[PDB]
Amino acid sequence: SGSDADKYTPETQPITTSEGKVPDPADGIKNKADLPDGTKYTWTNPDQVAQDVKTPGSHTETITVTYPDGSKDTVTVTVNAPAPEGQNITTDQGKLPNPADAIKNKDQMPDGTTYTWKQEPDVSTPGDHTGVVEVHFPDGTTYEVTVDVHVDAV
Numbered sequence: 001s002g003s004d005a006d007k008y009t010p011e012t013q014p015i016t017t018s019e020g021k022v023p024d025p026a027d028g029i030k031n032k033a034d035l036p037d038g039t040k041y042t043w044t045n046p047d048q049v050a051q052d053v054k055t056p057g058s059h060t061e062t063i064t065v066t067y068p069d070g071s072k073d074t075v076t077v078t079v080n081a082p083a084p085e086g087q088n089i090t091t092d093q094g095k096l097p098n099p100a101d102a103i104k105n106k107d108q109m110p111d112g113t114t115y116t117w118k119q120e121p122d123v124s125t126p127g128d129h130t131g132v133v134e135v136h137f138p139d140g141t142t143y144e145v146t147v148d149v150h151v152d153a154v
Contacts, residue, residue, distance in 0.1 A: 004067030008035050012063070012077040019082065019110050020054045022046075025063040028077035040066035044074050054110075056083030056143060082108040084135040086147035093154040096123050099133040102147035112138040126153035 013030040017023050026032060026041040043049045044062035052059035058080050065073045087104035091097045100106060100115040114136045121131035128150050135143040 001071075003071035004036060004069045005065075005071035005073040008065075008067070008073070010035065010063075010065045010073055010075050012075050014058070014078040014080060016080045017053050019108060022050050022053055023079075025077075028061075028063050028079075029065070029075070035065070036068050038068050040064075042066065049079060053079060053081045054139070055141060056081055084109055084113075084133070084143050084145050086133070086145045088148045088150065090150040090152060091123055093126050093151050094123055096120055097149070099131075102131070102133050102149065103135065103145060109135065110138050118144055121147075121149035121151070123149070123151050126151045 011030040012028050015023055015028045022043065025043045029041055032039070042064040044064045049061045052061065058078050061077055061079045062074050063077055065075060082105060085104045086102055089097055089102050099117045103115060106113065116134045116136065117131055118134040119132040121129035123129070128148060130146055131149055133145045133147055135145060
């Protein structure tokens, strides 16, 4: 059509965000310098990206690229919100750790997130065990994390 949208090819790159924060959609475009001066970048669905960033995962979002000729291109980008990550821990035979100890990035979870054992590791037996930590978000959602617990013989 001879439009800018037909001429240019915006390339996306994954966006990593922090808990609940929507970034500038321009952050999702790898080759902004390729595009005309004054090209605009907009979250195509602001409500969706706002809700998606409040939960762990790699979420598919769309960015609208508005060109100076009035044409537009809507591209797909990943927005990554942190998930609770397990870390290996060690405990004495018989002792069940605080489940929070088995989560490596508690600081990346929403303020007020708490932790339980959904499935406790069997600490009465020395050796390597897995347990499941339940991550309890303030908004009432939860996340299960399989974690490794080494039990030292006593």
